[PDB]
């Protein structure tokens, strides 16, 4: 994953991605990458944190405690955020529990807010957990969409898959010089050789 494009040459605001230093990110590599995708109001972007408060990380997607991964949030006033209350991008609220880390909620049902349970017909209480985002490109500054991408690493006993140190320096010849080709290190002069290796 070419991490250079997102920090070295990027125009993405609020690149605070606690857990790993953005510098030399390409030189450190974890096991697997879990790409996320979110659309949040302008003010509610701060809710991405180790628990904190609010309607995010309590009923919405939750950030685990002591989590290691990077988070990015960039303004999306255009590119599928247009006039009228958008049909998509609706809340996830009114859950009996406070959710657990890393679990995904793809289930919808009428909430319970009283003694007797309504048998499927809405009325008193029994609130529908979902409400749509009523934003548009003519909103303020703290309410415009800010698409959030969360890159989740993993710390476990598994070998790292996404890697790649990159780095590059030129080659010299006929001069005593230090070399670190693939881990091996030594000192000496490098000359052209006629020996043939197997592929």
């Amino acid at each position, epitope marked *: 994953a070419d991490y250079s494009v997102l920090y070295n040459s990027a125009s993405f605001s609020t690149f605070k991605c606690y857990g790993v230093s953005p510098t030399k990110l390409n030189d450190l590599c974890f096991t697997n990458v879990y790409a996320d995708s979110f659309v949040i109001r302008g003010d509610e972007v701060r809710q991405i944190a180790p628990g904190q408060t609010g309607k995010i990380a309590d009923y919405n997607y939750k950030l685990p405690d002591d989590f290691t991964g990077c988070v990015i949030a960039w303004n999306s006033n255009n590119l599928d955020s247009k006039v009228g209350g958008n049909y998509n991008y609706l809340y996830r609220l009114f859950r009996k529990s406070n959710l657990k880390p890393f679990e995904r909620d793809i289930s919808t049902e009428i909430y319970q807010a009283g*003694s*007797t349970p309504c048998n499927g017909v809405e009325g*008193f209480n029994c*609130y529908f957990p979902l409400q749509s985002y009523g934003f548009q490109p003519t909103n303020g500054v703290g309410y415009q969409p800010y698409r959030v991408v969360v890159l989740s690493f993993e710390l476990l006993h598994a070998p790292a898959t996404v890697c790649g140190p990159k780095k590059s320096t030129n080659l010299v010849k006929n001069k005593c010089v230090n070399f670190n080709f693939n881990g091996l290190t030594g000192t000496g002069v490098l000359t052209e050789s006629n020996k043939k290796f197997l592929p």
Partner: antibody
Amino acid sequence: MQLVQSGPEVKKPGTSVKVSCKASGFTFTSSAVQWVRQARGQRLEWIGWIVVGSGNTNYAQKFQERVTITRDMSTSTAYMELSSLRSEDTAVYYCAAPYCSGGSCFDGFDIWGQGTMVTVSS
Amino acid sequence: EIVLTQSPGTLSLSPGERATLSCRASQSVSSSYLAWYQQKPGQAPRLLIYGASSRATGFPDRFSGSGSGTDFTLTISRLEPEDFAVYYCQQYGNSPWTFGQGTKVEI
């Protein structure tokens, strides 16, 4: 467990009106609010219900028009505006909300207020 | 939807009452979605029984009544003269959430 309402507002026959119900002592984030009508020596007419956790409301047969609610999530309040005020609207509006804390709560509307006193006179 | 018109009008007896009040309904309303408020002169109402299947958190005892869908009855059994004020039936579930006519009491 307390709920304080604004003072008696005096207005003109048909400009506007707005009433504030401050909710305290219970979790206002996930609850419901209702508004009714009262008078002297007269019955009670239900007006409109508000889920303050998520804005969804309907209104009585007399109150679909000239009536819309206002959320005002902050300050734990609830606003509700009436337009085209009529003479026979000298009413105490009141407000009610269930005692909710945690997500599942009591059914009956147990927490009430005291209401205002609006006089649409000259 | 509104044909409730609670049958009792004004009843006037000293304590020693076995009186009952009825909240008739147009259609059988599912229980536990009911309410029975108690308005007071110059004050705010209270709540006594939330759905004809239990009793509220804490309130004066010696009266608790329940009924069917079309006839949501209630009863009072020797209550003190302090609880002599206007009652109000109520319904939930179907919008609009309409109240009742109200019942009057006297000594």
